[PDB]
Amino acid sequence: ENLSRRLKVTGDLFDIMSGQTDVDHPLCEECTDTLLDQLDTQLNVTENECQNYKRCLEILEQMNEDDSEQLQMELKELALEEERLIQELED
Amino acid sequence: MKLYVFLVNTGTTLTFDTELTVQTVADLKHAIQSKYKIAIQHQVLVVNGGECMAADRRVCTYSAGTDTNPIFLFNKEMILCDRPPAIPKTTFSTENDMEIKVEESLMMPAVFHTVASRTQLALEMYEVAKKLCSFCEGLVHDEHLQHQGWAAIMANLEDCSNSYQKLLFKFESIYSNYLQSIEDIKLKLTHLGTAVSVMAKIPLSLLDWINVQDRPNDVESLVRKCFDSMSRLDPRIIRPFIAECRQTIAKLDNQNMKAIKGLEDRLYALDQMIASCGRLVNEQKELAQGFLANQKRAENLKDASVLPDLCLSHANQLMIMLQNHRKLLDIKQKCTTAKQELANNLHVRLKWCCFVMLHADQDGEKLQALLRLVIELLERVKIVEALSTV
Amino acid sequence: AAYVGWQSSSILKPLLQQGLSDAEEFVIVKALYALTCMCQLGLLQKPHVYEFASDIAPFLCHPNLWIRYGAVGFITVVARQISTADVYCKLMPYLDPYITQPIIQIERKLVLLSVLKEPVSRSIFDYALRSKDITSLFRHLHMRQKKRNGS
Amino acid sequence: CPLCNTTRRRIDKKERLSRLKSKQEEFQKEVLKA
Known part of the structure; x- marks a missing residue:
């Protein structure tokens, strides 16, 4: 019985939480409780995304960023080495 | 009125005859399968800024299907497989003949007494150039149509996202206040142990209805229900699942994909190029008409226009115009390839959203479970409180 | 999985474990193939995603040329599928278990394996595998590892 | 209340x-x- 009242309250609150209601009904004693609780779950989902986003931000280690300069020394030297290996294979 | 449809999956021109206009709903699918190279099982089509077509409603129900407001089509396997949208362009026999003729005309030398054949070839070239300019205009239209299919894809994403957000955020926020409601549920679980004790102490008209309700909600089943409800109800099970749902949403939320480059910004240049091609075709037609007037002038030139080199000048002008037109034919073929190019470029963000969709489809199975769980919670609160009062 | 797994994708995840119970190491290469294939298909990934990442992390130096190559391939396919920074955090730690150097196009499998350490001798563990009571010997090996990092 | 539809038992967060x-x-x- 109350489920619909709560569900409707839920759906209505989210709908309003979506930004689809009037600022008057918020004064409803039931309205305000959901207002905080609705915004609570909203910030909760914001966190549900942001915590995961921040998790790898540090996990995106600059080790490869350090590896970037390695190509500069690696590149020309490996080019010379490959040319020498090609000449040796040819002979 | 014949059906107008572009495979938003390709955003490409594959129209329908009015013959399928009033046929069954699956008739459009079978038409895409047979007439178009788009099978049924791995395929999709929906209404832009509207719902995905059901099995009954006609197109106009969501008014669309026109050459400027058609329906958007999606091949399920298209993104299901990597499938950078294939542009295996049909036999260029027309384009191949155009290339051969243009090469011959460039290699064609000045015409002395061959003016009639030269004018015939120039007229054929002008007509073919106009036909190709029209085909390329339809191609630029089909590019704008891929843009419209992308708008339809964004609308469908927004729609499905709204449904998923409704269900998910509903269960979630409901649990959000359910936290204190969770303390109430804990008190109810204490009362539940009490009620188990009472039922042990109460072996066995409204009582008849309550007992009937007891038949399909056996005691062990209800105890297991409460236990699992709490366990999976582990608040982290939501808050971690909360991060999970937010991640599914984000997976949907690829902002850069839609704002690729201001697709209208480049479509404007595409339309300007199509306009330049049409102007080139009109100039070629004007030159062919001048060639006819010059054939007339050469015929009348026996007496009053005895200046020389007329046939040579005509042949040279024909060759120059042919080279100019072939030049634009280059950009035309470049756009023909850019068809598949932008097709894969879109298929990228397509697959992005689609994988977000499949992951959030698992998430939505979880969200139906979450509904069921919150329902169990509240409805059981009421009814099982009654049944446990004993 | 092309048109049946949007929500039953996890129902395949149990099939994933069952295939992990498969007999053939060639079936194992086919497993890494179908692994990348689902990474394309998806719809039950995130949990099973990190699960496979961790599991492969040790299996990284897997001495099965078919298995090793198909693993690098499923790795590049997953790197496409999940991609994002999720790749770094979830796998690159699991990836560190093999990459001798962080020098690879993770979108590519050949360079990726090139980064990874050379696969260990599967033959040695197989003769070790050939044995029977290695299970307790397994506990002994765990104790030895703790010796490596422990007391 | 109209948003409450229940007996009278009695923003920036977004x-x-x-x-x-x-x-x-x-x-x-x-x-x-x-």
Whole structure:
């Protein structure tokens, strides 16, 4: 019985939480409780995304960023080495 | 009125005859399968800024299907497989003949007494150039149509996202206040142990209805229900699942994909190029008409226009115009390839959203479970409180 | 999985474990193939995603040329599928278990394996595998590892 | 109450969640750059 009242309250609150209601009904004693609780779950989902986003931000280690300069020394030297290996294979 | 449809999956021109206009709903699918190279099982089509077509409603129900407001089509396997949208362009026999003729005309030398054949070839070239300019205009239209299919894809994403957000955020926020409601549920679980004790102490008209309700909600089943409800109800099970749902949403939320480059910004240049091609075709037609007037002038030139080199000048002008037109034919073929190019470029963000969709489809199975769980919670609160009062 | 797994994708995840119970190491290469294939298909990934990442992390130096190559391939396919920074955090730690150097196009499998350490001798563990009571010997090996990092 | 539909037993938070979401968008851009 109350489920619909709560569900409707839920759906209505989210709908309003979506930004689809009037600022008057918020004064409803039931309205305000959901207002905080609705915004609570909203910030909760914001966190549900942001915590995961921040998790790898540090996990995106600059080790490869350090590896970037390695190509500069690696590149020309490996080019010379490959040319020498090609000449040796040819002979 | 014949059906107008572009495979938003390709955003490409594959129209329908009015013959399928009033046929069954699956008739459009079978038409895409047979007439178009788009099978049924791995395929999709929906209404832009509207719902995905059901099995009954006609197109106009969501008014669309026109050459400027058609329906958007999606091949399920298209993104299901990597499938950078294939542009295996049909036999260029027309384009191949155009290339051969243009090469011959460039290699064609000045015409002395061959003016009639030269004018015939120039007229054929002008007509073919106009036909190709029209085909390329339809191609630029089909590019704008891929843009419209992308708008339809964004609308469908927004729609499905709204449904998923409704269900998910509903269960979630409901649990959000359910936290204190969770303390109430804990008190109810204490009362539940009490009620188990009472039922042990109460072996066995409204009582008849309550007992009937007891038949399909056996005691062990209800105890297991409460236990699992709490366990999976582990608040982290939501808050971690909360991060999970937010991640599914984000997976949907690829902002850069839609704002690729201001697709209208480049479509404007595409339309300007199509306009330049049409102007080139009109100039070629004007030159062919001048060639006819010059054939007339050469015929009348026996007496009053005895200046020389007329046939040579005509042949040279024909060759120059042919080279100019072939030049634009280059950009035309470049756009023909850019068809598949932008097709894969879109298929990228397509697959992005689609994988977000499949992951959030698992998430939505979880969200139906979450509904069921919150329902169990509240409805059981009421009814099982009654049944446990004993 | 092309048109049946949007929500039953996890129902395949149990099939994933069952295939992990498969007999053939060639079936194992086919497993890494179908692994990348689902990474394309998806719809039950995130949990099973990190699960496979961790599991492969040790299996990284897997001495099965078919298995090793198909693993690098499923790795590049997953790197496409999940991609994002999720790749770094979830796998690159699991990836560190093999990459001798962080020098690879993770979108590519050949360079990726090139980064990874050379696969260990599967033959040695197989003769070790050939044995029977290695299970307790397994506990002994765990104790030895703790010796490596422990007391 | 009309939003309550129950016996009389008796905003800015959205803005905070929105600032969090803006930070999360910055993080997603960082993820793309990474």
